[PDB]
């Protein structure tokens, strides 16, 4: 209902720029103070800029002043953050957050957009099928999966049979290699008896490199 929907994150070279957006709905956007809050990997929340319901009047964390500009228009109900002269320490999830009465606090939150500032470049994954054994499947249960190799940045999305498969799916946290590329694996555990009749496809999604792979996992 009361929602904030953000866009605009990305991989960026140091010195680059990026504009985040946040489209509101289900509430009176015009009457709320709006913030951007970021969170570096493994770090805490950091408030970054605020703009009053009325527009124009704006506050900035010192971390970002002369570089970021918060704006709005209350007719499109949309909040912006122009980020110029990005540095590596600007790498964070950014959140849209609003607060009707000032001083109250904020409890509408966008879902977050990832900004990566690196001297980069994006690498899309190689996807490899992790085939069920003909040794384990003497018993009731079969483990099958997908190996998602050598991508940057974070994150990759993995789902199965286009989202239809849900039960018994564990996608593990990525490993950061020496190379500075990530790899992860998704595994589904399934009744071995299903292996002749049932199709298992892993749908691997990495936005930064515009990569969408579907890979059929078959017994070998």
């Amino acid at each position: 209902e009361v929602q904030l929907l953000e866009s605009g994150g990305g991989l960026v070279q140091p010195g680059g720029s990026l504009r985040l957006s946040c489209a509101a709905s289900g509430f009176t956007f015009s009457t709320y103070q709006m913030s951007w809050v970021r969170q570096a990997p493994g770090k805490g929340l950091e408030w970054v800029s605020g703009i009053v319901s009325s527009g124009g009047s704006t506050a900035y964390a010192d971390s970002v002043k002369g570089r970021f500009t918060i704006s709005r228009d209350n007719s499109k109900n949309t909040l912006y953050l122009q980020m110029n002269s990005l540095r590596a320490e600007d790498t964070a999830v950014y959140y849209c957050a609003g607060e009707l009465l000032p001083y109250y606090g904020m409890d509408v939150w966008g879902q977050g957009t990832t900004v990566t500032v690196s001297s980069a470049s994006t690498k899309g994954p190689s996807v490899f099928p992790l085939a069920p054994s003909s040794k384990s499947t003497s018993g009731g249960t079969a483990a099958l999966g997908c190996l998602v190799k050598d991508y940057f940045p974070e994150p990759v999305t993995v789902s199965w049979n286009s989202g239809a498969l849900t039960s018994g799916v564990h996608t593990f946290p990525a490993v950061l290699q020496s190379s500075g590329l990530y790899s992860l694996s998704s595994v589904v555990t399934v009744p071995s008896s299903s292996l002749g009749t049932q199709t298992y496809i892993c749908n691997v999604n990495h936005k930064p490199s515009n990569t969408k792979v579907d890979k059929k996992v078959e017994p070998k």
């Binding site: 606090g105 564990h170 490993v175 020496s178």
Partner: protein, 212 residues
């Protein structure tokens, strides 16, 4: 200008209370009654739980309370439940800006020790045709969050080309990790078997793969 210091971490047992301090200055936590607390689970947005020092948000149980003495605000959580395990951030207006506290990681203990499930995959045919080979050792459902991985080739240990992640809490505050052994297609072909050997609290579990 302005910090807002919290303890890094506090732990409690189920059913207990924990309190979390938040020390600012006369210019923030002491400089208004506009202290909020946030709760945030991994990978989700922070949830506002206390606002105006003492007021709970909709649907926040009574077992969350907030108070204040001078420049220190406090969050108390009583009857600690598994779901309270999370990070907590205070927040205050600060006149010409807003500030989050430094954050406290709250751990809720007991929870049964669990032995990991290990799943070992050998390199796929598609990979080996690409002239690479990766053995994938997936370790899940374990408690506490420390494991030790040893790799083997036939009899013997292999310490070259291993990348192992740090354990991370899965949904259920049970831990998962992975280990990756990168080989060449010919070193994979040149043994009878490879092993992933996982130790957790002195108990070793082994899984073994081989060419065909």
């Amino acid at each position: 200008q302005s910090e807002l210091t919290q303890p890094r971490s506090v732990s409690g047992s189920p059913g207990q209370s924990v309190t979390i301090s938040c020390t600012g200055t006369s210019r923030d936590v002491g400089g208004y009654n506009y202290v909020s607390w946030y709760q945030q689970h991994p990978g989700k947005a922070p949830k506002l739980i206390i606002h105006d020092v003492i007021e709970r948000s909709s649907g926040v149980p009574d077992r969350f309370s907030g108070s204040k003495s001078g420049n220190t605000a406090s969050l108390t959580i009583s009857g600690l439940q598994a779901e309270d395990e999370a990070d907590y951030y205070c927040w205050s207006f600060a006149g010409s800006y807003y500030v989050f506290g430094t954050g406290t990681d709250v751990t809720v203990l007991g929870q049964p020790k669990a032995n990991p499930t290990v799943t070992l995959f050998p390199p796929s045919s598609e990979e080996l045709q690409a002239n690479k080979a990766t053995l994938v050792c997936l370790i899940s459902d374990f408690y506490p969050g420390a494991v030790t991985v040893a790799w083997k080739a036939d009899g013997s240990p292999v310490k070259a080309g291993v990348e192992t992640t740090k354990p991370s809490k899965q949904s259920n505050n049970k831990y998962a990790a992975s280990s990756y052994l990168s080989l060449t297609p010919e070193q994979w072909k040149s043994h009878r078997s490879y092993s992933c050997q996982v130790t957790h609290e002195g108990n070793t579990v082994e899984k073994t793969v081989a060419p065909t």
